[PDB]
Write a protein that binds this ligand. Structure first.
Ligand code: S2S
Length: 291
């Protein structure tokens, strides 16, 4: 699967908020473009002259993530974060010359991402009480991945001492994205666990944090809540459910070619981190069928 690369797989079946540190520093920001940031301003001006209702918004930028030695006490992950914006994304990762910026970053900084906005996404493997994962169909009229299958998520907007507030906003934002798009009550959702980080190589390597969330409602109750909002309550055009039993072999199905890269990342990390049992009981042939 060339359109997705794993940057991080979390240990212990996934990390809770209390085990993650963030360092938010201007040292983690995008580098100014070789010919000046005027090229981003020019793309933005041109876009507003066709769509004058568009607005900019701040975003978190992922610089890097370091995992502690496995089995250790204390914080298990450090996230190095800077700040970016929707405007900087449209002028870099979304630009037709994004591959040229990646090559110049390798040359100048030894870092393919140095000249890229790289806004941080969040996504969820959302499981129902009757053991299904939740999937959403994208509109065929949108600019990125039209008509493809997605999972719930988004790109969080800002507002270990500033750090712990940033980790809280990341975990908070995946729950808020589930409530806004699936129309679920917040009290039906578990605290999220971080499964890992995946990169979208079709969007010049931008990364998404992928989380596991468990809902106390059944698939039928989740569908009712989603539909009861009506067409204006969601950006997606449909919802559907796959048994967790069948998610194991999803990359061998015709569904796999319809999944957007960030949803592929969520399902690969769910299979590696929540699936794949390590012990004798769940490992037994009747419970883990070979092939
Ligand atoms: C049309 S989209 O599928 O919502 N794609 C996006 C990609 C990046 C950003 C960002 N973090 O600036 C926001 C949205």
């Amino acid at each position: 699967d060339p359109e997705v690369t794993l940057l991080l797989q979390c240990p212990g079946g996934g990390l809770p908020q209390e085990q993650i540190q963030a360092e938010l520093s201007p040292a983690h920001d995008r580098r100014p473009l070789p010919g000046g940031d005027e090229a981003i301003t020019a793309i933005w001006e041109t876009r507003l002259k066709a769509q004058p209702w568009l607005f900019d918004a701040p975003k978190f930028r992922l610089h890097s993530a370091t995992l502690a030695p496995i089995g250790s006490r204390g914080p298990q992950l450090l996230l190095r974060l800077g700040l970016t914006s929707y405007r900087d994304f449209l002028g870099t990762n979304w630009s037709s010359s994004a591959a040229w910026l990646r090559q110049q970053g390798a040359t100048d900084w030894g870092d393919t991402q140095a000249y890229l906005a790289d806004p941080l996404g969040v996504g969820a493997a959302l499981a129902t009480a009757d053991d299904f994962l939740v999937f959403l169909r994208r509109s065929r009229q949108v600019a990125e991945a039209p008509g493809l299958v997605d999972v719930p998520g988004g790109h969080p907007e800002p507002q270990d001492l500033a750090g712990q507030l940033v980790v809280h906003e990341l975990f908070s934002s995946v729950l808020q994205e589930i409530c806004d798009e699936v129309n679920l009550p917040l009290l039906t959702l578990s605290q999220p666990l971080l499964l890992g980080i995946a990169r979208n190589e079709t969007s010049a390597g931008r990364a998404s944090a992928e989380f596991y969330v468990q809902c106390s409602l059944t698939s039928e109750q989740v569908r009712k809540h989603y539909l009861s909002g009506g067409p204006e309550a969601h950006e997606s055009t449909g919802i559907f459910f796959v048994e967790t039993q069948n998610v194991r072999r999803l990359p061998e199905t015709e569904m796999w070619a319809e999944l957007c890269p960030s949803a592929k990342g969520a399902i690969i990390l769910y299979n590696r981190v929540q699936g794949s049992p390590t012990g004798a009981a769940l490992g037994s042939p009747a419970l883990l069928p070979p092939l």
